[PDB]
A paper describes a structure:
Insulin is a small protein hormone composed of chain A (21 residues) and chain B (30 residues), and it exerts its biological effects by binding to the ~340 kDa tyrosine-kinase type insulin receptor (IR). Insulin plays a central role in mammalian biology, and has a widespread impact on blood glucose levels, lipid and protein metabolism, cell growth/differentiation, and life span2. To achieve the stabilization of a specific conformation of the hormone, we developed the strategy of inserting a covalent bridge between specific sites at the B24–B30 C-terminus of the insulin B-chain, i.e., an intramolecular side-chain:side-chain crosslinking. The evidence for the structural impact of the crosslinking in the analogues reported here comes from three crystal (analogues 2, 10, 11) and two NMR (analogues 8, 12) structures.
The long (i + 5) separation between clicking groups was first chosen to assure a wide and gentle sweep of the main chain conformation, i.e., to minimize its structural strain, and to allow the B23–B30 chain to attain a conformation similar to the B26-like turn, or to the bend of the hormone observed in the insulin:IR complexes. However, the IR-A affinities of all of B24–B29 crosslinked analogues 1–5 were negligible (<1%), regardless of the R/S permutations of the Cα chirality of the crosslinking precursors (propargylglycine and azidonorleucine). The B24–B29 linker spans a long stretch of the B-chain, strongly affecting the local and global conformation of this inactive analogue. First, the linker significantly increases the mobility and disorder of this part of insulin, and it is well defined in only one of four independent hormone molecules in the crystal, with one B-chain untraceable after CysB19. Although the triazole part of the linker (in the most ordered molecule) occupies roughly the PheB24 site of the native insulin, the B23–B30 main chain is very distorted (e.g. 3.8 Å difference at the B25 Cα atoms from the native hormone). However, it seems that not the increased dynamics of the B20–B30 chain but a peculiar conformation of the large B24–B29 ‘macrocycle’ of this analogue abolishes its IR-A affinity. Any modeling of analogue 2 (or its B24–B30 part only) on the insulin:IR complex leads to large clashes of the B24–B29 loop with the L1 surface of the receptor, or its αCT segment. This extensive steric hindrance occurs despite the general, and reasonable, match between the triazole moiety and the PheB24 site on the L1 domain. However, it is also possible that the polar character of the electron-rich triazole ring is incompatible with the PheB24 hydrophobic binding pocket (Asn15, Leu37, Phe39 and Phe714) on the IR. Therefore, the lack of any IR-A affinity of analogue 2 likely can result from both the disruption of the B24 site (on insulin and IR), and an unfavorable conformation of the large B24–B29 macrocycle on the αCT-L1-domain.
Numbering used by the authors:
A (entry chain B): 1 to 27
B (entry chain A), D (entry chain E): 1 to 21
C (entry chain F): 2 to 30
């Protein structure tokens, strides 16, 4: 199934995707 | 924080974008 | 982390990015 | 298309946004 909760590596990948070259608070 | 907003609950693109920079 | 978006992870990425608007990849909400 | 761009290779946010409604 598709999980709409973002946990672990899926949360980390999601930050890469949405922030892009910005990087983020957890970089 | 991010864990409660996005893992426990479901977060939006904009909420996730608040952790950028 | 795996940076590729495949399978259920590609559908989830679209849910996240496109929001409730939907998308052309699959007829989800 | 989007599988080649984002699954086989790595895609940016703009590339996924091209598929949105």
């Amino acid at each position: 199934f598709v999980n709409q909760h973002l946990c672990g590596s899926h949360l980390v990948e999601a930050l890469y995707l949405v922030c892009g070259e910005r990087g983020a608070f957890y970089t | 924080g991010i864990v409660e907003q996005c893992c426990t609950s479901i977060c939006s693109l904009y909420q996730l974008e608040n952790y950028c920079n």
